[PDB]
């Protein structure tokens, strides 16, 4: 679970490549790899707490999709339920 509750973004595996030397494009002999190893890239994951019907709903969202939560906030129909009201504002149509 470092996974955006809106976009679905989750951590991915990326290699980290250490290169040495001077690009061929600069007239160097060209670049050499002194190591490759696995790393991860996490989504930029933030809390956003927002007030909806009675309650305080807090989402974990990739900062890219922070707007989607407020779009989702507009979206007001008939929910008197618990702080697990978000299952309703979670997505519906999308």
């Amino acid at each position: 679970s470092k996974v955006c509750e809106i976009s679905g973004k989750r951590p991915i595996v990326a290699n980290s490549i250490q290169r040495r030397g001077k690009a061929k494009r600069e007239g160097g002999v060209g670049k050499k790899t002194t190591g490759i190893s696995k790393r991860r890239q996490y989504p930029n994951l933030q809390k956003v707490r927002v007030r909806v019907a009675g309650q305080e709903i807090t989402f974990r969202v990739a900062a890219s999709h922070i707007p989607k939560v407020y779009e989702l906030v507009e979206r007001a129909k008939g929910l008197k339920l618990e702080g697990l009201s978000p299952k309703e504002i979670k997505k519906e149509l999308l």
Binding site: I66, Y70, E74
Partner: protein, 146 residues
């Protein structure tokens, strides 16, 4: 970021104005304090739909007044008062001027807002003014018997 101001906010301007401010300001101050909303395809539609609504109610009031303005800018009422010589035993109050207009010429009036001071104690020809917002002069003749 586009927000519709819900309240005159002073440098970042007037109500219903669509102002562009930083999201942090928007999300963590304006929106949660009910000081504005996101200017969306909908919330901007509801705004323009409601700039029309008011500008109808107003522009049908200025076309209400002037539409009953010309009624009594031409029509005149004459009220006989118990005579005296250029002094009235009673008076004619602004209240009275209403009652006249209903009785003769059948129009209706509130009747505040002409001149409430000095309920008029003398005979003569008077020109009195009316309301709300651009408005009417009226003509009242006072003479004698009943």
């Amino acid at each position: 970021m586009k927000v519709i101001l819900l309240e005159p906010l002073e440098n970042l301007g007037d109500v219903g104005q669509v102002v562009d401010v930083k999201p942090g300001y928007a999300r963590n101050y304006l929106l949660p304090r009910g000081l504005a909303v996101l200017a969306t395809e909908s919330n901007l539609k509801a705004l323009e739909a409601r700039i029309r609504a008011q500008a109808k109610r107003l522009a049908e009031r200025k076309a209400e007044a002037e539409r009953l303005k010309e009624i009594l800018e031409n029509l005149t009422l004459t009220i006989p008062v118990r005579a005296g010589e250029t002094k009235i035993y009673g008076s004619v109050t602004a209240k009275d001027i209403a009652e006249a207009l209903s009785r003769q010429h059948g129009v209706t009036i509130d009747p505040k807002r002409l001149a409430l001071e000095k309920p008029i104690k003398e005979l003569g020809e008077y020109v009195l003014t009316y309301k709300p917002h651009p408005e009417v002069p009226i003509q009242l003749k006072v003479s004698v018997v009943a």
